Amino acid sequence: LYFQGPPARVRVAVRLRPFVCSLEIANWRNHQETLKYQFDAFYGERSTQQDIYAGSVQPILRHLLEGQNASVLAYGPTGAGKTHTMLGSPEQPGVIPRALMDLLQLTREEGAEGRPWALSVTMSYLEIYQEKVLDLLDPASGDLVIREDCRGNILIPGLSQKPISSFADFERHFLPASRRSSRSHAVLLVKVDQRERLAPFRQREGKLYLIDLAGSEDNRRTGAINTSLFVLGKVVDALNQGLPRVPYRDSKLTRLLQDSLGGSAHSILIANIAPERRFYLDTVSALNFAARSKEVI
Numbered sequence: 143l144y145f146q147g148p149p150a151r152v153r154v155a156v157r158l159r160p161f162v163c164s165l166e167i168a169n170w171r172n173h174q175e176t177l178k179y180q181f182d183a184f185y186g187e188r189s190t191q192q193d194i195y196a197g198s199v200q201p202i203l204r205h206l207l208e209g210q211n212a213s214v215l216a217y218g219p220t221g222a223g224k225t226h227t228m229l230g231s232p233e234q235p236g237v238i239p240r241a242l243m244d245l246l247q248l249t250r251e252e253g254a255e256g257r258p259w260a261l262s263v264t265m266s267y268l269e270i271y272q273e274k275v276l277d278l279l280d281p282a283s284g285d286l287v288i289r290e291d292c293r294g295n296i297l298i299p300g301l302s303q304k305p306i307s308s309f310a311d312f313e314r315h316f317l318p319a320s321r322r323s324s325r326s327h328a329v330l331l332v333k334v335d336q337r338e339r340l341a342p343f344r345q346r347e348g349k350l351y352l353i354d355l356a357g358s359e360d361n362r363r364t365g366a367i368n369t370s371l372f373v374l375g376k377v378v379d380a381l382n383q384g385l386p387r388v389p390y391r392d393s394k395l396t397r398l399l400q401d402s403l404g405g406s407a408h409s410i411l412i413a414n415i416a417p418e419r420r421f422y423l424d425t426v427s428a429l430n431f432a433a434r435s436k437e438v439i
């Protein structure tokens with residue numbers, strides 16, 4: 143319901159990468175002033191892929207098996223480390239390979255033969271570019287329309303869904319679709335379909351979003367404005383300040399995530415930042431965007 147409890151918060155974290163939970167940064171407008179940003183978590187340069195994942199992502203997976211939705215988004219300027227955090231490499235796997243291994247192992251266990259629940263994992267992969275929704279699994283299929291059902295579920299009819307059981311099944315569809323990317327939102331959707339095999343025969347579904355956003359060079363508060371980054375900011379603020387109006391419908395991203403941001407959903411936004419001087423303006427801007435609180439000290 144709209145009333146009877148405020149909406150769930152959007153958790154916010156900062157990941158400061160090495161040179162290649164409050165943060166303090168110099169104010170180059172006034173050198174007597176220091177900018178102090180507050181987050182739900184802070185991961186410094188010594189924080190590894192497993193630290194990010196065990197600290198902020200692993201704990202929300204169990205909520206997908208309760209029929210709850212979850213969103214993980216990497217925000218920040220190009221070069222900051224969004225793709226490193228979200229995808230990573232075979233040496234240092236990111237959030238996506240870690241959550242996929244865990245979720246598939248969890249569903250292979252909880253949905254095994256003889257278990258009271260039948261579990262089926264599917265995947266979808268899309269891109270948000272210039273407010274157009276594009277299926278990365280079925281390219282050259284056009285701008286997709288986002289709909290809503292009578293129960294409040296967000297759905298994209300005809301967006302391709304691939305059934306997956308093992309990691310190889312995930313790799314089969316994901317790796318080729320992964321291969322501009324700095325200027326578009328990469329949305330991986332992992333859907334857990336749950337069927338009770340004994341009375342009362344309940345049916346659940348948990349949707350997990352893993353998002354590698356467009357570079358925040360395109361999101362300096364009032365460079366071009368990315369409608370979906372701008373509206374995400376408004377939506378995150380509305381949810382984390384308890385404002386009566388949340389403008390989900392003002393962008394494709396927030397409309398797609400309407401049932402996976404706020405409500406009873408679990409969500410984590412990671413503000414990826416870099417330590418180099420050449421990033422300073424985009425660092426300040428990413429911190430203003432994502433911080434749950436800000437002070438001038």
Ligand SMILES: Nc1ncnc2c1ncn2[C@@H]1O[C@H](COP(=O)(O)OP(=O)(O)O)[C@@H](O)[C@H]1O
Pocket residue numbers: 158159160162218219220221222223224225226227414
């Ligand atoms: N936490 C990190 N530790 C080490 N290297 C990192 C880290 N994050 C990013 N990098 C490196 O920084 C560069 C840019 O990172 P990338 O993930 O492509 O950023 P983005 O996707 O935000 O533009 C790459 O060479 C990548 O390996």
Ligand SMILES: [Cl-]
Pocket residue numbers: 188189
């Ligand atoms: Cl360490």
Ligand SMILES: [Cl-]
Pocket residue numbers: 189190191192234
């Ligand atoms: Cl690492």
Ligand SMILES: [Cl-]
Pocket residue numbers: 209210211401402405406407408
């Ligand atoms: Cl939910």
Ligand SMILES: [Mg+2]
Pocket residue numbers: 224225226323324354
């Ligand atoms: Mg990237």
Ligand code: NA
Pocket residue numbers: 143144145146147148149
């Ligand atoms: Na409510």
